[PDB]
């Protein structure tokens, strides 16, 4: 049974009834007015608890289920307010116990209907500075920094690169007071990342799932026969999982055991340059049958899957 249903709030609200013919209002509009509260001369809905932004490092996300739609609170006393018969506002007759105690997971969950989404932790400026120094000044490996602080190798590389950008923007004295206000405001909006705490730390034993390990296999062997992860690797013809974890640990730019000297054995000739020439030629050896444009290739220009790419300057080029 499917029917068009106007998205009336699930929580109860006062519904307009006998009204002057020259009002032309709707139950949805009055629901919003009840939820927002009065709009002052400045255009600010001070009553609504979500108008402001938290400064206590605890996110203030919507909890419609727990507060039964009562989104109005005193700006200073931070106590619930609800509409009465007289049309004024004041303390509720009873206290809502669900709002009293909220699990930390719910605190970090922004959307009520999706319990699989959580907001990451903002790293403190001190931690970023320490990571920068240890990578650069102390000349350590990003693997070590990841292991101590629990962050990922891409994250620590991003930390160092962003800190370098911040330093460059700083020695030019370009960052204005507005950006500092922005950072201060947003810094207190999300929880800080405590390397000491285990449950904030991010797991570093994460491996992409190969397509073959997602396919179920079963072997019937002597019960006594011991079967281990290495035998599984042999039968699945994949590198052992621990070995794959070790391999990805060395792919970081600052991680130990990294080398990208594979493509240093191709004959490349740079043509001579004379005065007045606006260009120079590079000649790279390429074996016949492996170089050139195919004859009779596919023409996807007029099809939905046409290839579209970008050049160095960023212009959209039909690759």
């Amino acid at each position: 049974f499917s029917r068009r249903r106007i998205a009336y709030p699930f929580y109860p609200f006062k519904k307009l009834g006998r009204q002057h013919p020259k009002k032309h209002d709707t139950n949805l509009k009055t629901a919003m007015r009840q939820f927002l509260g009065p709009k002052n001369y400045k255009g600010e809905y001070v009553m609504n608890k979500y108008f402001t932004v938290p400064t206590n490092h605890v996110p203030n996300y919507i909890k419609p289920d727990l507060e039964r739609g009562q989104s109005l609170e005193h700006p200073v006393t931070k106590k619930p307010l609800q509409l009465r018969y007289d049309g004024t506002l004041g303390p509720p007759p009873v206290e809502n116990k669900r709002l009293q105690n909220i699990f930390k997971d719910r605190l970090l969950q922004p959307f009520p209907s999706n319990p699989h989404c959580k907001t990451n932790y903002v790293l403190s400026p001190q931690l970023k500075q320490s990571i920068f120094e240890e990578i650069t000044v102390e000349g350590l490996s990003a693997q070590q920094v990841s292991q101590k602080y629990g962050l990922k190798i891409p994250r620590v590389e991003a930390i160092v690169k962003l800190v370098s950008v911040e330093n460059s923007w700083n020695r030019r004295n370009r960052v204005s007071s507005d950006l500092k206000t922005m950072d201060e405001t947003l810094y207190r909006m999300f929880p800080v990342f405590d390397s000491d705490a285990s449950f904030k730390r991010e797991n570093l034993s994460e491996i992409p799932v190969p397509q073959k390990t997602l396919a179920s296999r079963f072997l019937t062997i002597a019960e006594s026969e011991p079967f281990g992860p290495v035998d599984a690797a042999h039968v699945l013809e994949l590198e052992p999982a621990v070995e794959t974890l070790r391999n990805l640990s060395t792919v970081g730019e600052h991680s130990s055991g990294h080398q990208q000297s594979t493509n240093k054995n191709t004959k490349v000739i740079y043509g001579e340059l004379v005065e007045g020439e606006r260009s120079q030629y590079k000649f790279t050896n390429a074996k016949v049958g492996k170089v050139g444009y195919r004859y009779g290739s596919g023409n996807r220009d007029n099809k939905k899957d046409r290839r579209i790419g970008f050049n160095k300057l960023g212009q959209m080029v039909y690759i």
Binding site: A215, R217, F218, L219, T220
Partner: protein
Amino acid sequence: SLVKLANTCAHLQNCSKVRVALTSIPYTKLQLQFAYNLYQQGFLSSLQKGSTMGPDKDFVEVTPDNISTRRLWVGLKYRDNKPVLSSCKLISKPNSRIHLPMEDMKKLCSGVTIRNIKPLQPGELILVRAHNNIMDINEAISKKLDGEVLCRVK
């Protein structure tokens, strides 16, 4: 002989359904190898030589004078009111023999379909006849040998 093998497969099916404990199948090298592979993999309680009337307790020498009256005697198992040997059926029929290369055997065990042969299910084994020897498909892959897929027994 694929006809005899198909007959034995149907016979084992029927006996398991009516839930008998002892059964007789012809005397042949193919049947003996097939039964003993089943016995190793755990589908038969006991395999025994014997005549048409019953298994032979003592050693007996098989001669042309008594070759006709020889039948292997197999013992089926049951557990938790469910026969262990539920279904057993041929793959390579007598009219359409199937000879798969080793790579196709590996593909079959992996999960893909080759020659409209359903892949290897859990608790299943495909017997393969290579060089006059019957063995599990995994053993053939490990041994690198090649041959015809014979039957599935679940």
